[PDB]
C-alpha cells in the first residue's frame, strides 16, 4: 500500500516508523519547518522525499500529490488544514491520529487542555478524515489514565506510547481493507482552539486545584502558567495544592503559598520574568513578597 504522509513532532515520527514497520510504501512526507523528534530528519535519513510548504491547499500541491498516486493518506500531528481536494485523492481514504478520546477534545492541543480541565483520562484516536475536521469515524481508540502528578511532558510520552501501540495493530488492519468504523456522536463532541498566552494566565480567585491543573498543563517544556506581582510577570513551573484571606494574597513565603478562591497554591518552583527558575521561597524574595 502506498501512502503520502502529513506528519510532525514525536507523533509524526512514530507514525512514520509504524507505517514503515507495517510495510507501507511512503512516497512523500509533508511536514513543517520549526524537544521532540524531527520528522524531516527522519524522512531525510530514510530517503523519503519531504516537503514543508506553509499551505498545501492549492492546486500546485494537489497535482504533486496526485502524481504520487497514494492509495491512502495519513495525518500524524500535521498542524494545518489538508483540504478535501487532496484527501479525496486516496481511494482507501485518509486517516488522522488525534491525541484525545474523540469526540471529546477535537481541535488543538488536546494534551494541554485535558490537563487544564483536570481530566483523569485521555487517549489516542485514529479516525477517518471527513469534510469536518476531527469528526470522522473511529478506526480505533486507546485510553490512557492521567495521573495526578502527570504534567504535559509526562502525559505526552504516555500518549506517544499509546499511539505506538494503537498503530502497530491498526495499520496492518487498514492495509487489509476498510474497517467498520465507530461514528462520533456530534452531541458529545467538544472542540478547543489554539491556546493563547492568555490561556495560561493564573487567576487567583479560582480554586487552587484548577490553578494547579493549569500549572501542570503547560509545565516545562511548555511556556508555563503565569501571573503578575503588580506589574512583574512571573511563571509558576511547579506547584502543590493546599487546603481565609484575599485571593492572590501571600499566605507564606517559605514555602511560597498563595491564597486562592478555595484552598491555597504553593509555588514550588518558578521564575520572575525571563529570569532563571528557582525554588518558590527564593522566587518570593525575588518578587519582593512578604506574608
Curated annotation (Swiss-Prot):
Family, per entry: In the N-terminal section; belongs to the Fmt family. UDP-L-Ara4N formyltransferase subfamily. In the C-terminal section; belongs to the NAD(P)-dependent epimerase/dehydratase family. UDP-glucuronic acid decarboxylase subfamily.
Quaternary assembly: Homohexamer, formed by a dimer of trimers.
Protein name: Bifunctional polymyxin resistance protein ArnA
Organism of derivation: Escherichia coli (strain K12)
Site (Raises pKa of active site His): 134
Disulfide bond positions: none
Catalytic site positions: 98
Induction details: Induced by BasR.
A GO MF label: UDP-4-amino-4-deoxy-L-arabinose formyltransferase activity
Keyword set, alphabetical order: Antibiotic resistance, Lipid A biosynthesis, Lipid biosynthesis, Lipid metabolism, Lipopolysaccharide biosynthesis, Multifunctional enzyme, NAD, Oxidoreductase, Transferase
Positions of the record's site feature: Transition state stabilizer: 96
Function (record text): Bifunctional enzyme that catalyzes the oxidative decarboxylation of UDP-glucuronic acid (UDP-GlcUA) to UDP-4-keto-arabinose (UDP-Ara4O) and the addition of a formyl group to UDP-4-amino-4-deoxy-L-arabinose (UDP-L-Ara4N) to form UDP-L-4-formamido-arabinose (UDP-L-Ara4FN). The modified arabinose is attached to lipid A and is required for resistance to polymyxin and cationic antimicrobial peptides.
Region (Formyltransferase ArnAFT), start-end ranges: 1-291
Single GO biological process annotation from the record: UDP-4-deoxy-4-formamido-beta-L-arabinopyranose biosynthetic process
Taxonomic lineage of the native organism: Bacteria, Pseudomonadati, Pseudomonadota, Gammaproteobacteria, Enterobacterales
Cellular compartments per GO CC: membrane; protein-containing complex
Gene: arnA
Full-protein residues shown: 1 to 300 of 660
Sequence positions that bind (6R)-10-formyltetrahydrofolate: 80-82, 108, 130-134
Amino acid at each position: 500500500m502506498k501512502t503520502v504522509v502529513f506528519a510532525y513532532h514525536d507523533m509524526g515520527c512514530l507514525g512514520i516508523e509504524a507505517l514503515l514497520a507495517a510495510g507501507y510504501e511512503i512516497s512523500a512526507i509533508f511536514t513543517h519547518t520549526d524537544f521532540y523528534g524531527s520528522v524531516a530528519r527522519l524522512a531525510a535519513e530514510r530517503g523519503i522525499p519531504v516537503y514543508a510548504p506553509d499551505n498545501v491547499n492549492h492546486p500546485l500541491w494537489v497535482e504533486r500529490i496526485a502524481q504520487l498516486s497514494p492509495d491512502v493518506i495519513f495525518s500524524f500531528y500535521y498542524r494545518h488544514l489538508i483540504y478535501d481536494e487532496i484527501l479525496q485523492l486516496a481511494p482507501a481514504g485518509a486517516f488522522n491520529l488525534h491525541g484525545s478520546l474523540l469526540p471529546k477534545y477535537r481541535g488543538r492541543a488536546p494534551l494541554n487542555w485535558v490537563l487544564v480541565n483536570g481530566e483523569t483520562e485521555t487517549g489516542v484516536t485514529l479516525h477517518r478524515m471527513v469534510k469536518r475536521a476531527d469528526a470522522g469515524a473511529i478506526v480505533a481508540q486507546l485510553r490512557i489514565a492521567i495521573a495526578p502528578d502527570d504534567i504535559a511532558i509526562t502525559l505526552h510520552h504516555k500518549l506517544c506510547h499509546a499511539a505506538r501501540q494503537l498503530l502497530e495493530q491498526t495499520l496492518p488492519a487498514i492495509k487489509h481493507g476498510n474497517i467498520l468504523e465507530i461514528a462520533q456522536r456530534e452531541n458529545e463532541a467538544t472542540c478547543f482552539g489554539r491556546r493563547t498566552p492568555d490561556d495560561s494566565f493564573l487567576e487567583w480567585h479560582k480554586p487552587a486545584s484548577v490553578l494547579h491543573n493549569m500549572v501542570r498543563a503547560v509545565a516545562d517544556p511548555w511556556p508555563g502558567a503565569f501571573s503578575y506581582v503588580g506589574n512583574q510577570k512571573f511563571t509558576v513551573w511547579s506547584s502543590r495544592v493546599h487546603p481565609k484571606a484575599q485571593p492572590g494574597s501571600v499566605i507564606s513565603v517559605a514555602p511560597l503559598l498563595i491564597a486562592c478562591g478555595d484552598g491555597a497554591l504553593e509555588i514550588v518552583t518558578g521564575q520572575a520574568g525571563d529570569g532563571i527558575t528557582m525554588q518558590g521561597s527564593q522566587l518570593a524574595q525575588t518578587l519582593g513578597l512578604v506574608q
